[PDB]
Amino acid sequence: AFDWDAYLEETGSEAAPAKCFKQAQNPPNNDFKIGMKLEALDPRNVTSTCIATVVGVLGSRLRLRLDGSDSQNDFWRLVDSTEIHAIGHCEKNGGMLQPPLGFCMNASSWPGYLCKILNNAMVAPEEIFQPEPPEPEENLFKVGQKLEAVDKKNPQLICCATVDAIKDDQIHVTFDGWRGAFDYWCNYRSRDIFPAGWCARSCHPMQPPGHK
């Protein structure tokens, strides 16, 4: 459990206030179980919705993998993400499920495929999907502030970070003790940033600053 209060005091810093983030005041409960199927936006083509399977769970996050694709392109979504839904959601809304971009068969094999994987499949019930957190209506971050952030190159990891710079609705996230190579800009609404303490409150491991 990372001693944020010690760290803030030794670096002379403020943590960014909770009202800055689009995250629930309390981490949402994660009732998902590994093997459950659900519907998610294909990160490699965000216009497609695809069947995904929970392959890991960590704090309030799911590690998802799209059925019929590959094991090298897993992605993580919070249980209260608006990019995952219960199965049947897409269709109820006038949509069609799509094969993943990395689908391992040929396309005409897709309709048959959906049937086989949906047959007696373990499916996440709709009630375990958490509601979308209220959002701030402007950027309240400020240069200097510290926070917890997913490292988009190794997303299993959430790490101690700092806001470096601001241009309107974008913040620039830096990772303390790492070479600015893991830095990124993101919208203040991003679901990949959290107030200091969030990880401990949700049982997600939280990386201390790097050793550089």
Swiss-Prot record:
Record text on subunit structure and interactions: Scm associates with the PRC1 core complex containing PSC, PC, PH and Sce/RING1. Forms homotypic and heterotypic interactions. Interacts with the SAM domain of ph-p via its SAM domain in vitro. Interacts with corto in vitro.
Disulfide bonds: none
Entry similarity comment: Belongs to the SCM family.
Gene: Scm
Name the UniProt record assigns to this protein: Polycomb protein Scm
Organism lineage: Eukaryota, Metazoa, Ecdysozoa, Arthropoda, Hexapoda
MBT repeat segments: 2-100, 108-209
Span within the parent record: 175 to 385 of 877
Purpose of the protein: Polycomb group (PcG) protein. PcG proteins act by forming multiprotein complexes, which are required to maintain the transcriptionally repressive state of homeotic genes throughout development. PcG proteins are not required to initiate repression, but to maintain it during later stages of development. They probably act via the methylation of histones, rendering chromatin heritably changed in its expressibility.
Transmembrane segments annotated in the record for this chain: none
UniProt source species: Drosophila melanogaster (Fruit fly)
Swiss-Prot/TrEMBL domain comment: The SAM domain is essential for function.
Localisation: Nucleus
